């Protein structure tokens, strides 16, 4: 909602920040083994914990 | 005595465990007094206690407590033992005189239940299957 507490807004901030694709130069690292961000989240598909 | 704390006196089970009244605590009231003194004064050590009076509904005891960190206790041997970490909260483990009386400790034919140091010590030794390497 529009009304929210500071703690909720800070929680939503971190989830927003970490919901981004991995860098392209990560794929070039040695012994990478990482294909794509497996922890991506979409607002409509998966709802946050709160 | 200890009334069993079940709602409406219902102890769901076999008739042998239907008892609510006439049940008795396994530790004496003197031990309970020592435990309540020790819990409140958690920074002190219970030493002993004694009876000072009673009426129909109350029993009164006086518990000797020691400050383990006072210098009159720390600098004196023959009383330094109470300051060791192993001796904190004796009254909650039945190590005082009142608490120990309820454990069935003793020497000889009357106290075979506690050969091993305690009732559980005896029970484990008697109920462990010693499977050696060569049988």
């Amino acid at each position: 909602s529009s009304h929210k507490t500071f703690r909720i807004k800070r929680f939503l901030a971190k989830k927003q920040k970490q919901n981004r694709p991995i860098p392209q130069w990560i794929r070039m690292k040695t012994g990478n083994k990482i294909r794509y961000n497996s922890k991506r989240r979409h607002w409509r598909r998966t709802k946050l914990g709160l | 005595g200890r009334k069993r704390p079940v709602p409406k006196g219902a102890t769901y089970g076999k008739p042998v465990h239907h008892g609510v009244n006439q049940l008795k605590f396994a530790r004496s009231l003197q031990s309970v007094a020592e435990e309540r003194a020790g819990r409140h004064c958690g920074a002190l050590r219970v030493l002993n206690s004694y009876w000072v009076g009673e009426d129909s509904t109350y029993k009164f005891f006086e518990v000797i407590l020691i400050d383990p960190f006072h210098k009159a206790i720390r600098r004196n041997p023959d009383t330094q033992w109470i300051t060791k970490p192993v001796h904190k909260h004796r009254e909650m483990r039945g190590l005082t005189s009142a608490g120990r009386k309820s454990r069935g400790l003793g020497k000889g034919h009357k106290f075979h239940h506690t050969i091993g140091g305690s009732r559980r010590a005896a029970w484990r030794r008697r109920n462990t299957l010693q499977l050696h390497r060569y049988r």
């Binding site: 703690r7 929680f11 914990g49 709160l50 | -």
Partner: protein
């Protein structure tokens, strides 16, 4: 109607985040965490759930202090001393 219709009416949260243990089990109307029992001084912990115990046991987090204690134990917890300067 107990099924789909009644699911539309749920919009009021029972639980929120807990300032201790950080789980969404803090019952608002009871003011008590259902996982740690926060307003109680002691952590809620039951031996009938060994799986739940090992989810939040020591070592599952960071051990900012304990990992230094184990390292300091290997030299006897020395303080006030420095290596011999070059």
């Amino acid at each position: 109607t107990k099924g789909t219709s009644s699911f539309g009416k749920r919009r009021n949260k029972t639980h929120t985040l807990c300032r201790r243990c950080g789980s969404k089990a803090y019952h608002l109307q009871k003011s008590t965490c259902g996982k740690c029992g926060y307003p109680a001084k002691r952590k809620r912990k039951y031996n009938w759930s060994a799986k739940a115990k090992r989810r939040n046991t020591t070592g599952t987090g960071r051990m900012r202090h304990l990992k230094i204690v184990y390292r300091r134990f290997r030299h006897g917890f020395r303080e006030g001393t420095t290596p011999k300067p070059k």
